[PDB]
Design a protein around this ligand. Structure first.
Ligand SMILES: CCCCCCCCCCCCO[C@@H]1O[C@H](CO)[C@@H](O[C@H]2O[C@H](CO)[C@@H](O)[C@H](O)[C@H]2O)[C@H](O)[C@H]1O
Ligand SMILES: CCCCCCCCCC[N+](C)(C)[O-]
Ligand SMILES: CCCCCCCCCCCC
Ligand SMILES: CCCCCCCCCCCC
Ligand SMILES: CCCCCCCCCCCC
Ligand SMILES: CCCCCCCCCC
Ligand SMILES: CCCCCC
Ligand SMILES: CCCCCC
Lengths: 48, 48, 49, 48
């Protein structure tokens, strides 16, 4: 919890890339594109 | 005398490194710490 | 506290490196064993007739 | 004086490296001990 309150916020703010509004990694190609499509689909199944 | 001996450089090495890090936190700079740490010889020369 | 270290990432890194150095140095000079002392202590009186 | 020193820089970088080499020299030649052998108003003579 100390790392998540001290270091993790500092790393997220500095060394994390900007994600464009709308992008949920569905646009990505290869395996991760399929996993993001599958997961965003399963998230809708789950909520409903 | 046999059971260990001369762990002084070992401990004064990490002493410099922790002083460096603490100063790095004080000034929020990886470089400004050196402006302080270079005075170490100025005291030691007169003692010697 | 998080807002503080978002602006001060080097301070945040310094706390992490000191913890790791403190740990790494402690880890080298820790005892090693399978278990701690778990068996209860016992005293034996030995006599002979 | 310092205003003048900050126009020089390179001259005083050499003075510093001389002081460090001077410090380094004196440290190696200076013999080491643990604790001074003090007069305690008493001593013993062994006869064997
Ligand atoms: C006693 C211990 C011996 C170890 C060394 C200790 C440090 C030396 C003691 C401080 C003396 C500094 O003295 C100071 O020197 C600088 C030059 O270097 C002079 O500065 C002068 O020359 C420089 C360039 O050469 C010009 O840019 C400057 O405008 C001019 O005033 C100062 O006018 C003088 O007051
Ligand atoms: C392992 C403990 C680390 C101590 C962290 C010190 C937090 C200082 C931040 C002060 N403040 C709450 C005002 O931001
Ligand atoms: C133990 C190694 C510490 C590394 C610190 C690196 C600090 C830079 C953060 C990344 C910048 C993009
Ligand atoms: C982890 C994703 C959960 C998916 C839940 C799907 C359930 C659908 C069944 C509908 C039956 C009426
Ligand atoms: C520098 C890396 C430290 C972390 C590894 C600790 C291993 C401890 C070994 C036990 C020696 C008695
Ligand atoms: C564009 C390449 C697509 C790769 C498909 C990933 C494998 C699917 C695993 C079920
Ligand atoms: C260890 C708990 C920290 C709480 C700070 C808000
Ligand atoms: C904000 C101070 C928290 C202290 C953690 C031990």
């Amino acid at each position: 919890v100390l790392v998540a309150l001290i270091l993790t916020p500092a790393l997220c703010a500095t060394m994390l890339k900007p994600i464009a509004k709308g992008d949920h990694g569905e646009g990505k190609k290869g395996f991760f594109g399929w996993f993001n499509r599958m997961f965003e689909k399963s998230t809708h199944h789950y909520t409903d | 005398e046999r059971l260990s001996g001369n762990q002084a450089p070992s401990l004064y090495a990490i002493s410099l490194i922790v002083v460096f890090l603490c100063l790095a936190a004080l000034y929020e700079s990886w470089s400004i710490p050196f402006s302080v740490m270079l005075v170490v010889p100025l005291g030691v020369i007169g003692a010697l | 506290m998080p807002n503080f270290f978002i602006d001060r990432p080097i301070f945040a890194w310094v706390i992490a490196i000191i913890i790791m150095l403190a740990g790494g140095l402690a880890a080298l000079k820790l005892p090693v064993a399978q278990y701690p002392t778990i068996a209860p202590p016992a005293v034996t009186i030995s006599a002979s007739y | 004086s310092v205003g003048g020193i900050l126009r020089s820089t390179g001259r005083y970088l050499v003075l510093y490296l001389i002081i460090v080499v001077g410090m380094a020299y004196l440290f190696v030649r200076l013999p080491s001990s643990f604790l001074p052998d003090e007069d305690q108003g008493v001593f013993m003579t062994m006869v064997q």
